[PDB]
Amino acid sequence: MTQTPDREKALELAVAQIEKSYGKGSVMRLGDEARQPISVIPTGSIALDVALGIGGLPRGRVIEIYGPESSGKTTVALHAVANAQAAGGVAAFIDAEHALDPDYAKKLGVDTDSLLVSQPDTGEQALEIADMLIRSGALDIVVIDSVAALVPRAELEGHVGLQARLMSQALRKMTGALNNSGTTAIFINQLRDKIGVMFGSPETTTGGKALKFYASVRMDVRRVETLKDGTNAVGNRTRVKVVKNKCLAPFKQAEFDILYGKGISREGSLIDMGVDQGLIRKSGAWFTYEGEQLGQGKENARNFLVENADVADEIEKKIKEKLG
Protein backbone atom coordinates (compact mmCIF):
# COMPACT_ATOMS: atom_id res chain seq x y z
CA MET A 1 0.00 0.00 0.00
CA THR A 2 1.20 3.49 -0.95
CA GLN A 3 0.03 4.67 2.50
CA THR A 4 2.00 7.08 4.71
CA PRO A 5 0.05 9.68 6.76
CA ASP A 6 -3.38 8.08 7.26
CA ARG A 7 -1.34 5.18 8.64
CA GLU A 8 -0.38 7.06 11.79
CA LYS A 9 -4.03 7.98 12.25
CA ALA A 10 -5.52 4.48 12.26
CA LEU A 11 -2.56 3.49 14.39
CA GLU A 12 -3.22 6.31 16.87
CA LEU A 13 -6.86 5.18 16.90
CA ALA A 14 -5.98 1.50 17.32
CA VAL A 15 -3.84 2.27 20.36
CA ALA A 16 -6.70 4.33 21.80
CA GLN A 17 -9.18 1.45 21.67
CA ILE A 18 -6.65 -0.99 23.13
CA GLU A 19 -5.74 1.36 25.95
CA LYS A 20 -9.48 1.84 26.58
CA SER A 21 -10.32 -1.81 27.25
CA TYR A 22 -7.07 -3.08 28.76
CA GLY A 23 -5.53 -0.10 30.52
CA LYS A 24 -3.54 3.11 29.97
CA GLY A 25 -0.25 1.24 29.86
CA SER A 26 -1.32 -1.67 27.68
CA VAL A 27 0.72 -0.37 24.75
CA MET A 28 3.57 2.13 24.68
CA ARG A 29 6.56 3.21 22.64
CA LEU A 30 9.88 2.80 24.43
CA GLY A 31 10.42 6.49 23.73
CA ASP A 32 7.04 7.87 24.77
CA GLU A 33 7.32 10.71 27.27
CA ALA A 34 6.34 9.22 30.63
CA ARG A 35 3.07 10.05 32.40
CA GLN A 36 2.96 11.76 35.81
CA PRO A 37 0.59 10.84 38.66
CA ILE A 38 0.03 12.91 41.82
CA SER A 39 1.09 10.32 44.37
CA VAL A 40 4.27 8.30 44.11
CA ILE A 41 6.74 6.86 46.64
CA PRO A 42 10.34 7.88 46.14
CA THR A 43 12.69 4.89 46.30
CA GLY A 44 15.28 7.03 48.00
CA SER A 45 17.66 7.20 45.01
CA ILE A 46 16.82 9.87 42.46
CA ALA A 47 18.51 7.57 39.93
CA LEU A 48 16.07 4.66 40.36
CA ASP A 49 13.23 7.15 40.79
CA VAL A 50 13.84 8.52 37.35
CA ALA A 51 14.26 5.09 35.85
CA LEU A 52 10.89 4.08 37.14
CA GLY A 53 9.61 6.97 35.04
CA ILE A 54 7.08 8.46 37.48
CA GLY A 55 9.75 9.58 39.95
CA GLY A 56 9.10 6.86 42.52
CA LEU A 57 6.89 3.83 43.13
CA PRO A 58 3.29 3.68 41.83
CA ARG A 59 0.48 3.51 44.38
CA GLY A 60 -2.25 0.86 44.55
CA ARG A 61 -0.07 -1.39 42.42
CA VAL A 62 1.78 -4.63 43.11
CA ILE A 63 5.55 -4.14 42.79
CA GLU A 64 7.97 -7.06 42.56
CA ILE A 65 11.60 -6.81 43.52
CA TYR A 66 13.65 -9.90 42.68
CA GLY A 67 17.30 -10.82 42.46
CA PRO A 68 20.13 -12.59 44.36
CA GLU A 69 20.71 -12.58 48.12
CA SER A 70 22.40 -9.36 49.16
CA SER A 71 21.68 -7.49 45.95
CA GLY A 72 19.70 -4.78 47.71
CA LYS A 73 15.98 -5.60 47.54
CA THR A 74 15.18 -5.23 51.25
CA THR A 75 17.04 -1.92 51.50
CA VAL A 76 15.26 -0.60 48.42
CA ALA A 77 12.09 -1.89 50.08
CA LEU A 78 12.71 -0.47 53.52
CA HIS A 79 13.45 2.86 51.83
CA ALA A 80 10.20 2.74 49.89
CA VAL A 81 8.86 2.19 53.41
CA ALA A 82 10.71 5.00 55.20
CA ASN A 83 9.64 7.44 52.49
CA ALA A 84 5.97 6.50 52.49
CA GLN A 85 6.34 6.77 56.25
CA ALA A 86 7.80 10.30 56.33
CA ALA A 87 4.68 11.63 54.65
CA GLY A 88 2.69 10.30 57.58
CA GLY A 89 1.74 7.07 55.85
CA VAL A 90 1.48 3.76 57.71
CA ALA A 91 3.41 0.68 56.58
CA ALA A 92 3.20 -3.03 57.41
CA PHE A 93 5.82 -5.76 56.96
CA ILE A 94 4.63 -9.35 56.62
CA ASP A 95 7.61 -11.43 57.73
CA ALA A 96 8.12 -15.00 56.51
CA GLU A 97 11.89 -15.27 56.93
CA HIS A 98 12.54 -13.47 60.18
CA ALA A 99 15.59 -11.56 58.90
CA LEU A 100 14.72 -7.95 59.56
CA ASP A 101 17.23 -5.86 61.53
CA PRO A 102 15.39 -2.80 62.96
CA ASP A 103 18.58 -1.03 63.99
CA TYR A 104 19.52 -0.92 60.30
CA ALA A 105 16.06 -0.06 59.02
CA LYS A 106 16.09 2.65 61.71
CA LYS A 107 19.20 4.29 60.30
CA LEU A 108 17.37 4.27 56.96
CA GLY A 109 14.66 6.52 58.33
CA VAL A 110 11.99 3.94 59.15
CA ASP A 111 9.98 4.69 62.26
CA THR A 112 10.30 1.09 63.34
CA ASP A 113 8.37 1.78 66.52
CA SER A 114 5.12 2.23 64.57
CA LEU A 115 6.01 -0.24 61.87
CA LEU A 116 3.36 -2.95 61.64
CA VAL A 117 4.98 -6.34 61.47
CA SER A 118 3.32 -9.74 61.15
CA GLN A 119 4.95 -13.16 61.23
CA PRO A 120 2.37 -15.59 59.71
CA ASP A 121 2.25 -19.29 60.51
CA THR A 122 1.42 -20.48 57.02
CA GLY A 123 1.63 -19.07 53.52
CA GLU A 124 -2.07 -18.45 52.99
CA GLN A 125 -2.23 -16.74 56.35
CA ALA A 126 0.41 -14.26 55.23
CA LEU A 127 -1.47 -13.21 52.11
CA GLU A 128 -4.84 -13.06 53.88
CA ILE A 129 -3.58 -11.03 56.83
CA ALA A 130 -2.04 -8.82 54.18
CA ASP A 131 -5.39 -8.68 52.46
CA MET A 132 -7.54 -7.42 55.33
CA LEU A 133 -4.73 -5.18 56.43
CA ILE A 134 -4.87 -3.81 52.86
CA ARG A 135 -8.67 -3.52 52.61
CA SER A 136 -8.90 -1.24 55.65
CA GLY A 137 -7.81 1.51 53.29
CA ALA A 138 -5.55 2.43 56.17
CA LEU A 139 -2.17 1.17 54.90
CA ASP A 140 -0.07 3.14 52.46
CA ILE A 141 2.65 0.62 51.71
CA VAL A 142 2.68 -3.10 52.59
CA VAL A 143 5.76 -5.30 52.15
CA ILE A 144 5.75 -9.13 52.02
CA ASP A 145 9.29 -10.32 52.62
CA SER A 146 10.26 -13.27 50.50
CA VAL A 147 7.81 -14.98 48.20
CA ALA A 148 9.58 -18.33 48.52
CA ALA A 149 8.77 -18.47 52.23
CA LEU A 150 5.00 -18.46 51.87
CA VAL A 151 4.74 -22.26 52.23
CA PRO A 152 1.12 -23.57 51.78
CA ARG A 153 -0.78 -24.81 54.82
CA ALA A 154 -0.87 -28.14 52.99
CA GLU A 155 2.86 -28.71 52.55
CA LEU A 156 3.10 -27.52 56.13
CA GLU A 157 1.29 -30.78 57.02
CA GLY A 158 0.58 -33.33 54.23
CA HIS A 159 1.02 -33.01 46.88
CA VAL A 160 1.93 -30.61 43.99
CA GLY A 161 2.08 -26.98 42.66
CA LEU A 162 0.51 -25.56 45.81
CA GLN A 163 2.49 -22.33 46.20
CA ALA A 164 1.75 -21.35 42.61
CA ARG A 165 -2.04 -21.22 42.87
CA LEU A 166 -2.00 -20.00 46.43
CA MET A 167 -0.36 -16.95 44.93
CA SER A 168 -2.70 -16.87 41.94
CA GLN A 169 -5.81 -16.89 44.06
CA ALA A 170 -4.31 -14.50 46.59
CA LEU A 171 -3.15 -12.03 43.94
CA ARG A 172 -6.44 -12.14 42.09
CA LYS A 173 -8.44 -11.29 45.20
CA MET A 174 -5.83 -8.88 46.56
CA THR A 175 -5.20 -7.10 43.27
CA GLY A 176 -8.62 -5.45 43.40
CA ALA A 177 -8.38 -4.13 46.98
CA LEU A 178 -5.01 -2.53 46.32
CA ASN A 179 -6.23 -0.44 43.36
CA ASN A 180 -9.21 0.53 45.49
CA SER A 181 -7.12 2.04 48.28
CA GLY A 182 -4.00 3.31 46.56
CA THR A 183 -2.06 0.95 48.80
CA THR A 184 1.03 -0.23 46.97
CA ALA A 185 2.44 -3.65 47.81
CA ILE A 186 6.08 -4.75 47.44
CA PHE A 187 6.83 -8.46 47.11
CA ILE A 188 10.45 -9.33 47.82
CA ASN A 189 11.46 -12.30 45.67
CA GLN A 190 14.71 -14.14 46.21
CA LEU A 191 16.30 -16.21 43.46
CA ARG A 192 18.55 -18.62 45.38
CA ASP A 193 20.51 -18.79 42.10
CA LYS A 194 23.73 -17.38 40.57
CA ILE A 195 25.54 -20.43 39.15
CA GLY A 196 24.59 -20.27 35.47
CA VAL A 197 27.02 -19.10 32.80
CA MET A 198 29.44 -16.31 33.69
CA PHE A 199 27.34 -13.84 35.64
CA GLY A 200 23.72 -13.27 36.59
CA SER A 201 20.39 -14.15 34.96
CA PRO A 202 16.54 -13.94 35.33
CA GLU A 203 13.79 -16.49 36.26
CA THR A 204 10.59 -16.96 38.34
CA THR A 205 8.66 -20.17 39.18
CA THR A 206 8.85 -20.27 43.01
CA GLY A 207 5.28 -19.08 43.13
CA GLY A 208 6.41 -16.42 40.70
CA LYS A 209 4.59 -16.88 37.38
CA ALA A 210 1.42 -15.41 38.90
CA LEU A 211 3.34 -12.45 40.31
CA LYS A 212 5.35 -11.87 37.12
CA PHE A 213 2.05 -10.98 35.41
CA TYR A 214 -0.12 -9.41 38.11
CA ALA A 215 2.85 -7.24 39.05
CA SER A 216 2.75 -3.83 37.36
CA VAL A 217 6.42 -3.15 37.97
CA ARG A 218 9.19 -5.66 38.31
CA MET A 219 12.69 -4.74 39.42
CA ASP A 220 15.76 -6.90 38.75
CA VAL A 221 18.29 -6.04 41.44
CA ARG A 222 21.84 -7.33 41.34
CA ARG A 223 25.18 -6.35 42.84
CA VAL A 224 27.65 -4.87 40.36
CA GLU A 225 30.84 -4.22 42.39
CA THR A 226 31.91 -4.11 46.05
CA LEU A 227 32.63 -0.38 46.48
CA LYS A 228 36.28 0.10 47.50
CA ASP A 229 36.90 2.86 50.03
CA GLY A 230 40.68 2.89 50.20
CA THR A 231 40.17 0.98 53.45
CA ASN A 232 37.93 -2.09 53.02
CA ALA A 233 34.48 -1.54 51.51
CA VAL A 234 31.99 1.23 52.29
CA GLY A 235 29.21 -0.46 50.34
CA ASN A 236 28.35 -2.00 46.96
CA ARG A 237 27.22 -0.63 43.62
CA THR A 238 23.72 -1.92 42.99
CA ARG A 239 22.22 -2.05 39.50
CA VAL A 240 18.44 -2.26 39.14
CA LYS A 241 16.68 -2.92 35.88
CA VAL A 242 12.94 -2.42 35.71
CA VAL A 243 11.96 -5.11 33.24
CA LYS A 244 8.26 -4.49 33.68
CA ASN A 245 6.51 -1.19 34.16
CA LYS A 246 2.88 -0.72 33.12
CA CYS A 247 3.19 2.91 34.14
CA LEU A 248 6.08 4.27 32.05
CA ALA A 249 8.24 2.95 29.21
CA PRO A 250 10.00 -0.19 30.60
CA PHE A 251 13.53 -1.61 30.36
CA LYS A 252 15.28 1.38 31.95
CA GLN A 253 18.13 0.79 34.36
CA ALA A 254 19.82 2.47 37.32
CA GLU A 255 22.86 2.14 39.56
CA PHE A 256 23.62 3.44 43.00
CA ASP A 257 25.73 2.88 46.09
CA ILE A 258 24.53 1.21 49.28
CA LEU A 259 26.85 1.87 52.23
CA TYR A 260 27.28 -0.92 54.76
CA GLY A 261 24.91 -0.19 57.62
CA LYS A 262 23.93 3.10 55.94
CA GLY A 263 21.79 2.00 52.99
CA ILE A 264 21.20 3.89 49.71
CA SER A 265 23.44 6.97 49.47
CA ARG A 266 21.09 9.77 48.43
CA GLU A 267 23.96 12.22 48.05
CA GLY A 268 25.85 9.74 45.88
CA SER A 269 22.87 9.52 43.53
CA LEU A 270 22.72 13.31 43.38
CA ILE A 271 26.28 13.58 42.11
CA ASP A 272 26.08 10.86 39.45
CA MET A 273 22.79 11.99 37.96
CA GLY A 274 24.22 15.41 38.70
CA VAL A 275 27.04 15.12 36.17
CA ASP A 276 25.01 13.08 33.69
CA GLN A 277 22.79 16.15 33.48
CA GLY A 278 25.29 18.95 32.95
CA LEU A 279 24.32 20.44 36.31
CA ILE A 280 27.49 19.27 38.03
CA ARG A 281 30.90 19.77 36.43
CA LYS A 282 33.84 17.41 36.94
CA SER A 283 37.18 19.18 36.46
CA GLY A 284 39.47 16.17 36.84
CA ALA A 285 39.36 14.84 40.40
CA TRP A 286 37.37 17.99 41.22
CA PHE A 287 33.57 18.09 41.41
CA THR A 288 32.24 21.57 40.76
CA TYR A 289 28.64 22.74 40.93
CA GLU A 290 27.38 26.08 39.61
CA GLY A 291 30.80 27.61 40.18
CA GLU A 292 32.08 26.98 43.72
CA GLN A 293 33.59 23.52 44.35
CA LEU A 294 32.22 20.43 46.11
CA GLY A 295 35.19 18.16 46.62
CA GLN A 296 38.02 16.07 45.20
CA GLY A 297 36.67 12.59 44.53
CA LYS A 298 33.16 11.17 44.64
CA GLU A 299 33.40 10.46 48.37
CA ASN A 300 34.61 13.91 49.41
CA ALA A 301 31.68 15.17 47.35
CA ARG A 302 29.15 12.80 48.85
CA ASN A 303 30.36 13.95 52.25
CA PHE A 304 30.16 17.63 51.24
CA LEU A 305 26.66 17.05 49.94
CA VAL A 306 25.74 15.01 52.99
CA GLU A 307 26.56 17.75 55.48
CA ASN A 308 25.34 20.61 53.31
CA ALA A 309 21.78 19.32 53.26
CA ASP A 310 20.82 22.83 52.10
CA VAL A 311 22.69 22.59 48.78
CA ALA A 312 21.89 18.92 48.10
CA ASP A 313 18.18 19.66 47.97
CA GLU A 314 19.01 22.39 45.44
CA ILE A 315 20.58 19.80 43.16
CA GLU A 316 17.89 17.15 43.63
CA LYS A 317 15.42 19.92 42.75
CA LYS A 318 16.88 21.08 39.44
CA ILE A 319 17.25 17.52 38.15
CA LYS A 320 13.54 17.38 38.93
CA GLU A 321 12.73 20.51 36.92
CA LYS A 322 14.95 19.13 34.14
CA LEU A 323 12.77 16.01 33.75
CA GLY A 324 10.42 15.69 36.75
Ligand SMILES: Nc1ncnc2c1ncn2[C@@H]1O[C@H](COP(=O)(O)OP(=O)(O)OP(O)(O)=S)[C@@H](O)[C@H]1O
Ligand atom coordinates in the same frame (compact mmCIF):
# COMPACT_ATOMS: atom_id res chain seq x y z
N1 LIG B 1 21.18 -5.46 59.21
C1 LIG B 1 22.13 -4.99 58.35
N2 LIG B 1 23.29 -4.50 58.88
C2 LIG B 1 24.27 -4.02 58.05
N3 LIG B 1 24.26 -3.96 56.70
C3 LIG B 1 23.09 -4.46 56.17
C4 LIG B 1 21.99 -4.98 56.90
N4 LIG B 1 21.00 -5.38 56.05
C5 LIG B 1 21.50 -5.11 54.84
N5 LIG B 1 22.76 -4.55 54.83
C6 LIG B 1 23.50 -4.17 53.56
O1 LIG B 1 22.60 -3.96 52.47
C7 LIG B 1 22.95 -4.76 51.28
C8 LIG B 1 21.85 -5.73 50.87
O2 LIG B 1 20.54 -5.40 51.34
P1 LIG B 1 19.76 -6.67 51.93
O3 LIG B 1 18.87 -6.25 53.06
O4 LIG B 1 20.68 -7.81 52.27
O5 LIG B 1 18.78 -7.05 50.66
P2 LIG B 1 18.69 -8.23 49.57
O6 LIG B 1 17.39 -7.61 49.25
O7 LIG B 1 20.07 -7.81 49.28
O8 LIG B 1 18.63 -9.19 50.86
P3 LIG B 1 19.05 -10.78 51.17
O9 LIG B 1 18.19 -11.08 49.88
O10 LIG B 1 20.47 -10.32 50.90
S1 LIG B 1 18.37 -10.38 52.97
C9 LIG B 1 24.31 -5.40 51.60
O11 LIG B 1 25.38 -4.89 50.80
C10 LIG B 1 24.49 -5.22 53.13
O12 LIG B 1 25.80 -4.92 53.56
